[PDB]
Amino acid sequence: ATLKYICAECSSKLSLSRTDAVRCKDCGHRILLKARTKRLVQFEAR
């Protein structure tokens, strides 16, 4: 039900904003991805 960022190994929908630094709830590794977008995307079948 809604999300933002992600643990690069201990992948756990995190999410945050301004000045909240950039770590993870435990697994320090300040890397973080950003998981897809809800809006569907279409592709060609060829």
């Binding site: 992600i6 643990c7 690069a8």
Partner: protein, 65 residues
């Protein structure tokens, strides 16, 4: 990196025979050339399609998230 569906050259389907093929080896302990003829791959165009291919995917999966 995942068997290919159908043989680029002629087109016949192929993507299913993977496990079937990779099986007539480890289990039925056979020699490639014979296994293929047994999977219906008669011509080299398709024949080659399988014989070659490398399932890198498997090594990909072994990763993580």
């Amino acid at each position: 990196m995942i068997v290919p569906v159908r043989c680029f050259s002629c087109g016949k389907v192929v993507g299913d025979k993977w496990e079937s093929y990779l099986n007539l080896l480890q289990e039925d302990e056979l020699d490639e050339g014979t296994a293929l003829s047994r999977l219906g791959l008669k011509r080299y165009c398709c024949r080659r399609m399988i014989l070659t291919h490398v399932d890198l995917i498997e090594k990909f999966l072994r990763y993580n998230p």
